[model samples]
Target: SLLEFGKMILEETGKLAIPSYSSYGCYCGWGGKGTPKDATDRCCFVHDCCYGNLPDCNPKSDRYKYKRVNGAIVCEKGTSCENRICECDKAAAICFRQNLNTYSKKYMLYPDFLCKGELKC
Candidate 1:
């Protein structure tokens, strides 16, 4: 299984595959602890609070997962934890759009952050 294969690789490498964008200011990702520099960052911060414990929330839901339809984030369905995560994300997405101008490109780079996948941030 590709998922398991990837998981095994990361576990063996001693690098925890936590949020790639998380490292400073609790802006774009969950750094466990930090302050928000702007309203956009606050959106992520609130979502982080809603997420609470990472390990607890991790298995229960697919974190930081979503789809952009017509330039809007479309959250999917799930159970208890999954449902909560989806709701939190949807709210954050809305907040993000509302403050789209506050979004910073500088955070998506090496020192501030390191995005892994398709999205630049």
Candidate 2:
């Protein structure tokens, strides 16, 4: 039965679970790239990438702009410009990496961010 299968799956999968950060939704890594041996799920930049930063909005710049702040990458007052290159900090690339260390770090550091995979965000 469906109920029995659900219970069995949970038991087999383990009982451990983590809480979600944004809007209090449970964190399940639902939207992100890569495939896991146990299961498969779609990747979401909106929920998994560099939280609240725009780096992809400007395609014309030397750097591939992948995010937009207030409809532009150029920073204004009240926003710190450490990189001065427009878009997020050069370290933003740190959050963009897809490996476990970078990915985990980004998720823990930024609650909502932007990211790019093989496809557009």
Candidate 3:
């Protein structure tokens, strides 16, 4: 839901202007700091939102690690929190795949005028 909103803003309004207004988002660190830089970063933004609160939503222990099955990543059925976290990551990973080409050094650079987000790398 939130991801769709972010996507809508990214695709519609952001690209509608003649000059393509600059929109830097998601410092995208442990849980995203600022706005996103591109589609990939946007995914991170959505992931952060999907995760809702931080540290609390974070796993208390590294219990679910095995991934032998195709769709059993949420081992032991887990809780709704863990399930949502898994779903968020999966969505972001897929988003990154779709916009893999949009990945660029600009987002990593400090003073990029073309693509800007998060002052630090």
Candidate 4:
């Protein structure tokens, strides 16, 4: 009986833990909308909200250099940004920027010689 119980416990342990967000009605904060709308629509809504609210980095901003690296616009490596309104909004924009960079690297064919150093803004 003890061996069977131990086997059951092992099998249960193999199951992946549920994410904390799973307990919520809608993880994205769109309660009723999530029922009719797809996840992609919700994701776009979040992205647009973040992008629309985020303050544009000035061309001459001293905090970070903006550059078109491998054809994707990005803040230079080692740059840090702080949020004036909401930190989540700032984080969302940062995530979007990284995704853009990743997409550029995958699709854009650039020669190694051209990537010698960070390109100017």
Candidate 3, poorest ten consecutive residues by summed lDDT: 15-24
Task: Please write out the lDDT profile of model 4 over residues 20-98, one tens digit for every residue.
Answer: 1112222222222232122322332453454345556321132333344564434344333322222333333344333
List, residue by residue over 1-121, the lDDT tens digit for candidate 1. 1232223223333333233224423455434334466576676677666666434665332543445578555555655666566666566556655665665655542243332222112
| Candidate with more favorable, higher TM-score: 1 or 3 | 3
Q: Over 4 Å off in model 2, which ranges?
A: 1-9, 17-110, 119-121
Q: lDDT of model 4 at residue 40? A: 25
Worst 10 residues of 4 by lDDT: 15-24
lDDT of 3 by residue, 1-121 (tens): 3343233324423432111222223434443454466786676577567666545666333222214255333323556655555566555545655675676645543233333345332
Per-residue lDDT tens digits for candidate 2, residues 1-121, read: 1232222223323321122112211123333433211111111233233333536332123232223356333333432322233333322222223222322323432332333325333
Ordered list by lDDT, greatest first: 1, 3, 4, 2
Best by TM-score: 3
TM-score head-to-head 2 vs 4, winner = 4
Q: How many backbone clashes does candidate 2 have?
A: 18
What lDDT would each prediction earn against the true structure?
0.48, 0.28, 0.47, 0.30
Q: What TM-score does each of the candidates earn? A: 0.50, 0.19, 0.51, 0.22
Predicted structure with the largest lDDT when compared to the true one: 1
Each model's backbone clash number = 0, 18, 6, 0
